Design a protein around this ligand. Structure first.
Ligand code: FAD
Ligand code: TFB
Length: 491
């Protein structure tokens, strides 16, 4: 039989969405004054983001000339090209007297393409995929080796940023692959630990590890072999992190691995060599219905094992695959929400739960969403101290938002720390991570995609998720209905 908290997790696995969302709503609701402050801050963060290099203000003036003379796009553009040519006349007197969407962006590296594609064509296609992967993935990778990544840390660390490094690579298929990942992780801990040089788990850099890298065919692995084989590896790495006093974070992956990951964490927290050390980190995904129940479990685990757990709250990286897997298994429901706004509500409710127990949990709020960030900033309350919480972001996505956050108040920043997640590796380790970033950046529901859509007003972009849910409820007839285009698997 399971403990009370473990049993509650299991029972919530595929809770009906009407139920799960209805339950979260009042825990996610910000009191009116807090809601108002969160809105104003979110608005201001998002405004600066958009209007970097005057993107919006330039977009204005354009529309005016593109009307005050009655013209279309190509009309205005043509008029600019001439104006530019006229502006290149040195002397004023002389002047006065006179599938293939991002094909454009792809061209700067260099309907008729459709024929070229049909023509030019599998070893080609496989080669095309590999190079496109590298080209797009570059912006998300901090270095090829941990040494290169680390030798790059000073610039942002001196501004108050922190790092968590990820030696890319996951889902080991063979015993040999898992062993190689083990060696890579170990190597990385030695390097990060030496660089950290005693700065500790808060100020100093840490590492993020995927359990799927450390065990062959983890996706279908049984408890008995995971404990016999994976656990000693997890323990070994964590002991080494502890010797260097750096944080070590256990990544959250597919939802059917949540249970085994909790079993591993439970065992890890009771190792004698880790007594009194608070550097163990664990990620939880707010897009899961189980998330708040996992928090209750974690709170009890911190108490029983006598430590402060580092808990990274994220929304989640595997949503597309989760929906697909659930539709294939034909079960009673989904282990994740089907509307993005419900994940947002879940994240806010879970953030409140984490912030309530600062003796037991150090919350690490991973997000690139300006509203989510502003809400957490307000929910954390008055009298911030550095060890209360931190924000986190992915390299290549979070820096512009967080340049308004980490740093001095005198320089116009919020003075809250952000830990940058820093992937390290060569092209052979990049694929899976890059695909997830493509899904994240390309989704019409994602904040980073919406903020780039200048037709979407700021107020809509940073709209309160709880209010959004209640708006849906008033229109649709009940709270927390599933996405209209995502029926239950058995339907
Ligand atoms: C530093 C860092 C570490 C992370 N570590 C992990 C990890 O170990 N494991 C992991 O799984 N994730 C992890 N993530 C999260 C993941 O990689 C995405 O970055 C994150 O979910 C984006 O959230 P947001 O607040 O930035 O963006 P938003 O645009 O606010 O939120 C986007 C998220 O909404 C969710 N979503 C999208 N569509 C729907 C829908 N129709 N219904 C319900 N939910 C939906 C997805 O989770 C999506 O990522 C991490 C993120 C960061 C910044
Ligand atoms: O691998 C991923 O896509 C997420 C983001 C960082 C770690 O887990």
């Amino acid at each position: 039989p399971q403990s009370v908290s473990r049993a509650a997790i299991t029972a919530a696995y595929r809770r009906p969405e009407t139920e799960a969302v209805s339950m979260l709503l009042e825990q996610a609701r910000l009191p009116q004054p807090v809601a108002e402050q969160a809105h104003k801050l979110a608005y201001q963060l998002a405004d600066k983001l958009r209007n970097q290099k005057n993107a919006s203000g330039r977009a204005g003036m354009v529309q005016g000339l593109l009307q005050e003379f009655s013209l279309s796009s190509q009309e205005g553009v043509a008029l600019m090209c001439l104006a530019e040519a006229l502006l290149r006349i040195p002397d004023k007197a002389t002047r006065d007297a006179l599938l293939f969407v991002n094909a454009a962006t792809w061209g700067l590296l260099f309907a008729s393409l459709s024929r070229s594609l049909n023509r030019i064509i599998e070893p080609l296609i496989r080669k095309g995929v590999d190079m496109a992967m590298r080209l797009m993935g570059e912006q998300f990778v901090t270095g090829e080796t941990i040494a290169e990544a680390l030798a790059n840390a000073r610039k942002l660390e001196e501004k108050g940023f922190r790092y968590s490094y990820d030696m890319l690579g996951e889902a080991a298929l063979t015993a040999a692959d898992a062993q190689a990942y083990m060696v890579s992780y170990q190597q990385a801990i030695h390097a990060i630990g030496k660089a950290s040089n005693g700065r500790g788990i808060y100020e100093g850099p840490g590492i993020s590890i995927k359990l799927s890298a450390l065990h062959p065919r983890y996706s279908r692995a049984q408890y008995d072999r995971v404990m016999e084989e994976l656990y000693p590896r997890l323990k070994s790495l964590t002991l080494l992190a502890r010797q260097y006093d750096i944080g070590i974070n256990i990544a959250a992956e597919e939802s059917d691995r949540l249970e085994i990951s909790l079993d591993l964490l439970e065992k890890l927290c009771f190792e004698p060599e880790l007594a009194g050390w608070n550097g163990i980190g664990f990620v939880i995904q707010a897009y899961q219905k189980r998330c708040p129940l996992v928090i209750d479990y974690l709170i009890d685990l911190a108490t029983r094992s006598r430590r402060r757990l580092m808990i990274r709250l994220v929304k989640g990286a595997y949503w597309d695959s989760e929906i697909k897997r659930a539709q294939m298994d034909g079960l009673e429901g989904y282990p994740v929400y089907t509307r993005k706004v419900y994940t947002d509500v879940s994240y806010l409710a879970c953030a409140k739960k984490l912030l309530a127990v600062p003796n037991l949990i150090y919350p690490q709020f991973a997000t690139h969403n300006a509203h989510t960030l502003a809400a957490i900033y307000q929910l954390a309350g008055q009298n911030y101290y550095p060890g209360q919480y931190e924000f986190q972001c992915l390299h290549g996505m979070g820096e512009p938002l967080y340049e308004q956050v980490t740093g001095k108040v005198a320089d116009g920043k919020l003075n809250r720390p952000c830990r940058i997640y820093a992937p390290v590796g060569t092209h052979e380790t990049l694929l899976a991570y890059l695909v997830r970033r493509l899904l994240e950046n390309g989704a019409n529901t994602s904040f980073v995609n919406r903020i780039a859509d200048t037709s979407l007003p700021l107020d809509e972009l940073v709209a309160d998720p709880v209010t959004a849910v209640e708006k849906l409820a008033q229109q649709e007839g009940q709270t927390g209905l599933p996405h209209p285009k995502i029926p239950l698997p058995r339907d």
